[PDB]
Write a protein that binds this ligand. Sequence first.
Ligand SMILES: Nc1ncnc2c1ncn2[C@@H]1O[C@H](COP(=O)(O)OP(=O)(O)OP(=O)(O)O)[C@@H](O)[C@H]1O
Ligand SMILES: Nc1ncnc2c1ncn2[C@@H]1O[C@H](COP(=O)(O)OP(=O)(O)OP(=O)(O)O)[C@@H](O)[C@H]1O
Lengths: 567, 567
Amino acid sequence: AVLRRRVVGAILMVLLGKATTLALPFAYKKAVDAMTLGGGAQPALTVALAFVLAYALGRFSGVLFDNLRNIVFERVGQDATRHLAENVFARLHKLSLRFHLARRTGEVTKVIERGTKSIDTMLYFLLFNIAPTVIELTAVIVIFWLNFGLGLVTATILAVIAYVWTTRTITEWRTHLREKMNRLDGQALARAVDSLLNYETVKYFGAESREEARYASAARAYADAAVKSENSLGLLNIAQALIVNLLMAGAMAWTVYGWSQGKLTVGDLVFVNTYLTQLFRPLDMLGMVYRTIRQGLIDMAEMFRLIDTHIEVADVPNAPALVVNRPSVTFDNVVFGYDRDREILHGLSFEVAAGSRVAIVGPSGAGKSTIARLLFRFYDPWEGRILIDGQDIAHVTQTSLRAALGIVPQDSVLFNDTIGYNIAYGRDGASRAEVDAAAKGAAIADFIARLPQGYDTEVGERGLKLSGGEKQRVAIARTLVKNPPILLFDQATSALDTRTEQDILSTMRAVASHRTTISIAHRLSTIADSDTILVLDQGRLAEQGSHLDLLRRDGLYAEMWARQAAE
Amino acid sequence: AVLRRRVVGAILMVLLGKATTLALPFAYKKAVDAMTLGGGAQPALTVALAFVLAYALGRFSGVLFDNLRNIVFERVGQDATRHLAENVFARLHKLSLRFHLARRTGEVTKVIERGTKSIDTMLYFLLFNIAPTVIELTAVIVIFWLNFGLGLVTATILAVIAYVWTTRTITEWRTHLREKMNRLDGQALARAVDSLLNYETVKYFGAESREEARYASAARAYADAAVKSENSLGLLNIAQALIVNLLMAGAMAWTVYGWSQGKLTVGDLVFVNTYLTQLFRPLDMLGMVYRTIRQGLIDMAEMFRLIDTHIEVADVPNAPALVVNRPSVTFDNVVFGYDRDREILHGLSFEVAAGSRVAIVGPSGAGKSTIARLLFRFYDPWEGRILIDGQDIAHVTQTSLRAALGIVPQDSVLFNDTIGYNIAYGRDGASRAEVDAAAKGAAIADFIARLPQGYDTEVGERGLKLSGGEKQRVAIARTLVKNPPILLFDQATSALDTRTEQDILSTMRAVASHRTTISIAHRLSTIADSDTILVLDQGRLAEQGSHLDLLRRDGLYAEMWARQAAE
Ligand SMILES: Nc1ncnc2c1ncn2[C@@H]1O[C@H](COP(=O)(O)OP(=O)(O)OP(=O)(O)O)[C@@H](O)[C@H]1O
Ligand SMILES: Nc1ncnc2c1ncn2[C@@H]1O[C@H](COP(=O)(O)OP(=O)(O)OP(=O)(O)O)[C@@H](O)[C@H]1O
């Protein structure tokens, strides 16, 4: 509502700058009163005073208006940037898991910040350089048609057309170097950020100099590309300057052609030269702003290509919610692979009973975390389907599905905040009672109590300032705070000692009264008291049954289990 | 290097630009002689043509010289930028682990980009706006001091002094808003990046809207700060423009006062106004050049201040190298805490014998990964010391120390590249034979062979496109490729099943026959066949000895072992 008023005032400030653009010809009137009635009279002094008022205030009136425009437009501009940024962030959290797994933080950060800065500059240039230069050029044309004639304006319009054509050709020739420079910079920053993510790895193998040289190669490649791009910019500027200066010469040469004095001996030449000076400004601004908006649209296209192309998992039209009356999982002939060149799950079918305690075991690489990810609908299966209480996961909203599921993941990450924030993250606005209950049920309560800052101790980036077992128990506390009707533990008790592991096992058994618990574990002794044990091998269900049943069948599970008994 | 020659040419271009600066007033003299003499009917036609030619050529040569300066300085600028970026990166990889653990990637990235963007334009402005304007001011003052009295020149210098006072006052008032805006933008970007790092966590607890609103709050805070900063910038610009335009008014008022035609010479007024315009063009830049170099140097000071913040672990002067004749490690009364408010290790002392296979066990939080980190000298101990073959770790170079150690870490991270790159990352220039041997000793050979892209399969960011056990085995392959004289496995077989765990254990036993192996493990069954077992409790050495000996002692180790036997 008020942004409209602000931009209206901005256009009015543009019109006041147009009043200054009028004031510059106004000195033509001074020049008219110079030769006809000059020395030996009163007007000889009138040239001075009226000049200062026209000049001193006039120039001051111009810039003062321009900056005022800025101060009345900044809120409109920043909001737009913010409105983009928030939207970008809102879309950034709606991208598929494949992207955020295969992403390169460096080049994607470059693309995001570049797109934001591009729209930030492009809105300003679109609102403050297109319309003002168009108005000024229209006024130039009408004033030279009412004061000079038809020939000069036609010569100037064809000169400007050749100028625009040359600019377009040079920009089409420069686009290649521009894109190459951008790609090289993105690759360099991606390499730098990925090296910094593996700081500990770089220290572990004495590979500081290797990474230094690796980044240096990309840096000098980008440097060469930028040299080429800026030299192309300089060439375009030299061409534009040649066009402008030859047009200036033609305009200053065709005025004295009729007579030595012309129609107006004093005033014609000053009108022409002032208009040439105030014409070099719109061409200098217009070429740069046209190519700037071109690059801004290409950066917006790049950014929005990265953003909007990522539509993997989506809700069906008018999708109902998940109604969890019985927390029962059903994999029906599930066929899935992450990439089409390697199938991972081959017709997997199993029924996790409602309110049961089912374990999922198998050798490394068998595809257990893929079962977890498919249950969460991070990916969709190729064939078959997944049911929760007889409801197809593919035909229900993602929010209601993921709300009914709580997972302690294989590789858990924490926010760079305090312990209490991460623990309370399970539910939106968790009370200290709930957070303390989860921290007590996760064998982490005494540890936090012995902490000097307690729930306010820092965990650092990804939670790496805590131990492995402490971080595991923090993730357990999060999933306890959430308390959904389907609990899933993907190697949850790996980083724990046997004592804390038995504590967490007693907890998991206590909170599984009428709720479903799916425990993926390689430490078989923890899942020995489960209702059913599903053994997975190369993406197929090898065996299924009780611990005693599978031990007696003497198949894959028994061997594995007996492989624990070897030591 | 050769860049010196380039900058010489750059200054030459600058002087050629000054050749244009002379030519614009120099032409006006030829126009002066049209009023009184030149009435042979020939010279009236010579003066005009020569003026037009001189003006067109002057302007075109000016822009041409400027662009040539740019094109001959671009290589020097890019070189400088690249060298700065490389230095920043090199120092970024030499900061302590405390920084990279407590760092916030967003605001640090903001600071880095700010410093780079500042230096890129700062060098250009320092070399092409400071020195040219200084030379122009010296020439203007020395030539105009013999033609004008004391009043005008002293008024101009006092006007410039008042200009400097106004600029300094407004900049000192704006520095606060600038720094606050910078801090808010850094915090907003840090929050956004930390939310994106926890993408999976945000998906696990349905907290998209929470993070969206959090970033939106930070964004609107930054928007308000930026609006304030830009309004302050506009106020400074209007003040500077007022000062400059009133000075031009005073210069165009005290010169026209003497006579209607000229105060002291025939061409006083036009010479004065031409030099005033050709000084106002560089002056309008100068009012932006002081704050640009000031804020660029102060942001450089901020960046390099943060970087130069004295690192934690450093080499002693003239530090010798580590000579591992017998890999026997000795923690002698090691007292350490990460923060001063919580001590972790309380007088820890233990002797890992040369060529033995020692295990480190204990409850979660006891401080075992702290033993590993102190052995790597990521931190220095408060009391006591650490010895490798009787040599103080604190008195030896960090590089030679970390070369003698190879670690499979608790939380392993891979580079966003192929599997083969990560495996070969161990040694500098590893042969494909060694990489295949490591992949065979890490139970991944058959897996990678069954991969369609084999060693060229992507692992994604942090290696999260591979499983947990696959990533563990890849890290084992790295540490095997490195082949150092002291191997340390911090919960290396956690993500593996018992079968692959026995494979990796057979590997660990095939290697390190007469080498030291320190295994930190919670899965006690794997370390039961060790030479000695160090039990750690709350940061102290509880017991030590053989599996049978500690089992006989019926202490902390036995209890833990018995806790596996619970049914
Ligand atoms: N981003 C990806 N691209 C391609 N394949 C993937 C990706 N993520 C997972 N996989 C597939 O998943 C399988 C390995 O992960 P899986 O889901 O088996 O984990 P897991 O068996 O739970 O891990 P572990 O038992 O090793 O701890 C392999 O078949 C692998 O191809
Ligand atoms: N930079 C730091 N600032 C504060 N505390 C830290 C820092 N780094 C580590 N710690 C603390 O050290 C402890 C972890 O040390 P360590 O990882 O050796 O435990 P652990 O017993 O070996 O782990 P686990 O046995 O659970 O794998 C935690 O209490 C953690 O808070």
